[PDB]
Design a protein around this ligand. Sequence first.
Ligand SMILES: NCCCNCCCCCC(=O)NO
Ligand SMILES: [K+]
Ligand SMILES: [K+]
Ligand SMILES: [Zn+2]
Length: 617
Amino acid sequence: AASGSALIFDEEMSRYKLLWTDPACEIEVPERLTVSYEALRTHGLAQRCKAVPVRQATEQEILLAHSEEYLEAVKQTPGMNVEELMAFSKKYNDVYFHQNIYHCAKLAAGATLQLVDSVMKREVRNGMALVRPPGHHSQRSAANGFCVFNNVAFAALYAKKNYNLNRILIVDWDVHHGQGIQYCFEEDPSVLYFSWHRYEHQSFWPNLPESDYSSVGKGKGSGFNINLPWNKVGMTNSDYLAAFFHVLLPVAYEFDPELVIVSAGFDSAIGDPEGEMCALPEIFAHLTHLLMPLAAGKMCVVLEGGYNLTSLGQSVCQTVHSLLGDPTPRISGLGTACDSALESIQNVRNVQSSYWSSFKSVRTVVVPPPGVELTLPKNCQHSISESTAKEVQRIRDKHFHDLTDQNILRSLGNIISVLDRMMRSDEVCNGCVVVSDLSVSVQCALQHALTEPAERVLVVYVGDGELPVKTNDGKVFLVQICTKETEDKCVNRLTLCLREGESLTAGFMQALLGLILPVAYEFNPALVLGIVEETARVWGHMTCLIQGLARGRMLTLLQGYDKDLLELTVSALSGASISPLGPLRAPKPEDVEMMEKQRQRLQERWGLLRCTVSESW
Ligand SMILES: NCCCNCCCCCC(=O)NO
Ligand SMILES: [K+]
Ligand SMILES: [K+]
Ligand SMILES: [Zn+2]
């Protein structure tokens, strides 16, 4: 399988700049590239990525998305002086030209195609290209918004032609609307374009009516263009995550893309002069991580905007951190989206209701049963202290007097050993332990974590019984996926009873993206505890996405030995790729009704669940 992450960059693309007075473009400086690459080198991230050289995009590759007349007009700019370059740039909106910009434009485009090839050739698992000029505003016969050629549009068309892909997802989290990408794939159902952008009721640049939520695509591409307009500035982490959980992610996993291309503009981060939003650079580590379970991890990150030189480097490294599989930082202070964001999210979901189902040294430690030996990935390891042995003795005599099964005692010693290495040693991140007795193992795992201390523990249990888990003090949230419909009493437990059949994968994924993840992210646990009983596919996507919480510190307790299940949890816990879910039969209405009743029951306490504007009394 593929491994590593590509970092495509070249200092040549920082060798064009603005040569005349223009306050509209004076923020697009060469230092954007040099600051971002040097930030990756300072933090040791560039040295960890496979450096792929940039090449020039050929003429025929440029003609994939641009006209011959516009290409030949740009081709003449290297021969122009300052006066002629100023006159040529006046023919367009918010863009300047340079003697070298046509050279770097072909390099920025070629760098994107180099990144597409390395990912599609399985030479790397994912990658990022630091390019200038940007591209998502560029159109078929016009330069626009600092862009000359549409790099991301090139990547999708290049991937369609040379690899025969049928479904490509484009995620534009830049703060500006990439109308060039929208125009290019307006009638193409093979490319799904998502974009959030500062809109302010069309008053913000580029002031386009097509940037609104009602532009869903044209013809056979209807429903494959998703615009989410930000009508107020200061959007926070809660707004960005609500946009993912309730708009992008449900559509993305139903779309099931064969490749993910990200128009990664970081002017959506706090401190940027263009965006004026308030999301921290840490949010981009999660925006990346939440998309990695798609397309078997094949993700191509292309740089677009980002103009606060300090805010830029921080978010670039947070993106590469997630691409390399590093633990995601904890996000605190999460809550409901603001009213403006909730109105936007509500409107996009309604207009897309007719096109999509959901609307209207060691990273992992494994302890198999005694004697079972299995092949482990490179970053995983098998399992005992004398202090742990004494503590298991102390736990036994106080809480389990009539208990002598010396193999049950073995697992409890491993649970303490694994948890001690996860929280305190900082050398182990997560782990998986095969378990015989559930009630004693869950009790030991949960109680030992609270005194570690883990101030908050999220428990995700796939079973039917009741477990020794107290959820009455705010330190524990219980997520239970069961077979028997249980009346949920209190606002700190989430019980999902899915009506059995061939619709469980679709219903579970909708509950994962729409209920579990929004609640888990607001809860901000210090450790995740996964529990699966013997009587109890989709667990790989759950294990990977849930690692966005608690810095990826998850302990999974598997009851009984299933090598297939064991091998999948360990693979997902270790950071390996997750095989894509195929086409899923749309969820049963009885499950959607059940999931919406739980949202009504919990969204007043966990505002991140809200996908509507609350009714004021
Ligand atoms: N604050 C006033 C609005 C001026 N807007 C200038 C357009 C440049 C677009 C660059 C970009 O980041 N594209 O993604
Ligand atoms: K955007
Ligand atoms: K589209
Ligand atoms: Zn931008």
